[PDB]
Design an enzyme around this catalytic site. Sequence first.
Site, PDB file in Angstrom:
ATOM      1  N   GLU A 111       5.927   8.912   5.106  1.00  0.00           N
ATOM      2  CA  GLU A 111       5.832   8.617   6.715  1.00  0.00           C
ATOM      3  C   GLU A 111       7.196   8.999   7.217  1.00  0.00           C
ATOM      4  O   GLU A 111       7.454   9.598   7.866  1.00  0.00           O
ATOM      5  CB  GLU A 111       5.447   7.382   7.049  1.00  0.00           C
ATOM      6  CG  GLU A 111       3.752   7.104   6.558  1.00  0.00           C
ATOM      7  CD  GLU A 111       3.129   6.356   7.208  1.00  0.00           C
ATOM      8  OE1 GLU A 111       3.572   4.902   7.469  1.00  0.00           O
ATOM      9  OE2 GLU A 111       2.184   6.497   8.069  1.00  0.00           O
TER      10      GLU A 111
ATOM     11  N   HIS B 187       1.064   5.694   1.213  1.00  0.00           N
ATOM     12  CA  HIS B 187       0.973   6.821   2.105  1.00  0.00           C
ATOM     13  C   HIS B 187       0.891   8.073   1.114  1.00  0.00           C
ATOM     14  O   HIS B 187       2.019   8.003   0.633  1.00  0.00           O
ATOM     15  CB  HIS B 187       1.528   6.650   3.178  1.00  0.00           C
ATOM     16  CG  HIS B 187       1.587   5.613   3.983  1.00  0.00           C
ATOM     17  ND1 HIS B 187       0.615   5.543   5.163  1.00  0.00           N
ATOM     18  CD2 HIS B 187       1.983   4.528   4.251  1.00  0.00           C
ATOM     19  CE1 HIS B 187       0.549   4.314   5.831  1.00  0.00           C
ATOM     20  NE2 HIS B 187       1.746   3.552   5.228  1.00  0.00           N
TER      21      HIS B 187
ATOM     22  N   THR C 199       2.459   1.490  11.240  1.00  0.00           N
ATOM     23  CA  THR C 199       2.412   2.891  11.564  1.00  0.00           C
ATOM     24  C   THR C 199       0.767   3.486  11.445  1.00  0.00           C
ATOM     25  O   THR C 199       0.494   4.458  11.536  1.00  0.00           O
ATOM     26  CB  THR C 199       2.977   3.803  10.220  1.00  0.00           C
ATOM     27  OG1 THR C 199       2.422   3.291   9.058  1.00  0.00           O
ATOM     28  CG2 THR C 199       4.564   3.378  10.071  1.00  0.00           C
ATOM     29  N   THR C 200       0.018   2.317  11.555  1.00  0.00           N
ATOM     30  CA  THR C 200      -1.274   2.535  11.732  1.00  0.00           C
ATOM     31  C   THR C 200      -1.939   1.583  12.883  1.00  0.00           C
ATOM     32  O   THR C 200      -1.001   0.630  13.040  1.00  0.00           O
ATOM     33  CB  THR C 200      -2.450   2.093  10.510  1.00  0.00           C
ATOM     34  OG1 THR C 200      -2.053   0.744  10.167  1.00  0.00           O
ATOM     35  CG2 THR C 200      -2.022   2.842   9.407  1.00  0.00           C
TER      36      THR C 200
ATOM     37  N   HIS D  44       0.807  -1.058   0.194  1.00  0.00           N
ATOM     38  CA  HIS D  44       0.049  -0.048   0.100  1.00  0.00           C
ATOM     39  C   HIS D  44       1.030   1.228  -0.154  1.00  0.00           C
ATOM     40  O   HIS D  44       2.204   1.164   0.001  1.00  0.00           O
ATOM     41  CB  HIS D  44      -1.048   0.049   1.238  1.00  0.00           C
ATOM     42  CG  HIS D  44      -0.350  -0.096   2.441  1.00  0.00           C
ATOM     43  ND1 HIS D  44       0.226  -0.987   3.034  1.00  0.00           N
ATOM     44  CD2 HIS D  44       0.465   1.180   3.116  1.00  0.00           C
ATOM     45  CE1 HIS D  44       0.704  -1.020   4.185  1.00  0.00           C
ATOM     46  NE2 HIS D  44       0.950   0.632   4.360  1.00  0.00           N
TER      47      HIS D  44
ATOM     48  N   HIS E 141       4.805   0.919   0.935  1.00  0.00           N
ATOM     49  CA  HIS E 141       5.160  -0.140   1.770  1.00  0.00           C
ATOM     50  C   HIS E 141       4.812  -1.501   1.406  1.00  0.00           C
ATOM     51  O   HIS E 141       3.684  -1.983   1.247  1.00  0.00           O
ATOM     52  CB  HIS E 141       4.211   0.197   3.108  1.00  0.00           C
ATOM     53  CG  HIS E 141       4.861   1.298   3.998  1.00  0.00           C
ATOM     54  ND1 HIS E 141       4.014   1.990   4.817  1.00  0.00           N
ATOM     55  CD2 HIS E 141       6.069   1.897   3.653  1.00  0.00           C
ATOM     56  CE1 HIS E 141       4.677   2.972   5.305  1.00  0.00           C
ATOM     57  NE2 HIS E 141       5.998   2.776   4.756  1.00  0.00           N
TER      58      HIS E 141
HETATM   59 CO   LIG Z   1       2.079   1.794   5.624  1.00  0.00          CO
END
Ligand SMILES: [Co+2]
Length: 258
Positions: free
Chosen positions: A104, A94, A196-197, A92, A117
């Site tokens: 990020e 960001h 990171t989520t 995915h 990522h």
């Molecule tokens: Co990510």
Amino acid sequence: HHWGYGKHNGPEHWHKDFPIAKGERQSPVDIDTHTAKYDPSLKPLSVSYDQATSLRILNNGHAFNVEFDDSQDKAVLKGGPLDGTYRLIQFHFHWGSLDGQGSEHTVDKKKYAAELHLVHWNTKYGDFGKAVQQPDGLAVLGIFLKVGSAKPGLQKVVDVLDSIKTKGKSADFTNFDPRGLLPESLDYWTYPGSLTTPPLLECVTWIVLKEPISVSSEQVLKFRKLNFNGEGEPEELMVDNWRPAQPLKNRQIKASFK
Ligand SMILES: [Co+2]
């Protein structure tokens, strides 16, 4: 309430439901290139994606995931700082509302337009849900996106996005080759960190490539037409779905190169 990236439920609020957000090995981080230590003990990365089997692309309300068949060792990462074999499960991105933000990780405080990522899980733990409960459970390959020339290998992704505009929509996405998203060089930085989520679990070995890929403005513009909301809800463009850099704390970033 439910987490997201808006002013009332964004990254600064996550610690209330997910106290690990203020943990000792949270991601992302700023990569201070002068302070990262060259580690000649680090091996070259081994990306073996020849037999990758993509299946589906999903808008999950935060990002879109391209999902792979991970029921066999078809697409694996090994080498570098890793022990053992890690299977690709999804990738995915960001990205930002503007080309000046979206990644990020940052590099000497530089923000890129987006960050890819590629998420992999350690086969010694049998599946993804077990792997995220382990400190060496995941290996995430991070690749920066800058805006310039188009990335030919990205266009198949960009072209299906209008079929998954809203949260909960998926589409078949077979025969996609993730090798077409890799830069020429596999030089990298690596450190121990987290998802990171939410749930922000501290299970990731991060491997961040030094060399960015370039994508075109038109390509990134199509990312920004996605929606965070579900169909028939008020439209909220899916932009700025990045968590900012977290304190490095007691960690050292290592570099594979000089
Ligand atoms: Co990510």
